[PDB]
């Protein structure tokens, strides 16, 4: 199921629109975007695991992942409202 | 850049897509499907594109805004 295989080339889009009929150009582009979205998802699925293994080897073995999407940003945080827009003056 | 993901910053829509550009009534047909190209090292599909339209020439009419304004400035 791993994408990193020669059998799976990023070139599975050439023989797509060769023969069949095409309609108003709004939905084939959406189909391509959806397919690339799927490809990116299965790419990241093992990219994260590879990063976890690399970090575990590089540092202390115990490593745990946690999804930090916007719903979590509500969790404890720090705010230097003043020093908020970090910049260099002078 | 870290503070952007820490805070609610980023994630906003761009400004390019606000302007509405597009075409209507587009006519579409099959590519040539022959592979003779002087660049034999490249992929098969790129060769098919090249034969249909031919080799590019004059390197100026093609926009490439990196060099078009440089050529204008030189002239």
């Amino acid at each position: 199921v791993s994408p990193f295989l020669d059998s799976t080339p990023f070139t599975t889009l050439h023989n797509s629109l060769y023969g069949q009929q095409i309609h108003s150009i709004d939905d084939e582009l959406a189909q391509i975007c959806k397919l690339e979205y799927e490809l990116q998802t299965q790419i990241a699925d093992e990219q994260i695991t590879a990063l976890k293994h690399f970090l575990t080897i590089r540092t202390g073995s115990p490593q745990e992942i946690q999804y930090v999407d916007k719903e979590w940003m509500k969790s404890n945080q720090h705010v230097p409202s003043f020093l908020g827009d970090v910049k260099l003056m002078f | 850049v870290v503070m952007g993901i820490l805070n609610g910053k980023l994630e906003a829509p761009t400004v390019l897509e606000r302007l509405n550009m597009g075409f209507k009534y587009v006519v579409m047909s099959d590519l040539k499907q022959d592979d003779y190209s002087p660049y034999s090292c490249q992929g098969l599909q790129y060769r098919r594109m090249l034969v249909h339209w031919g080799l590019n020439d004059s390197r100026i009419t093609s926009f490439d805004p990196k060099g078009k304004l440089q050529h204008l400035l030189a002239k």
Partner: peptide
């Protein structure tokens, strides 16, 4: 839906 696209039927 927004960009109309036509094609040749069988002269291709």
């Amino acid at each position: 839906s927004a960009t109309g696209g036509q094609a040749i039927r069988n002269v291709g």
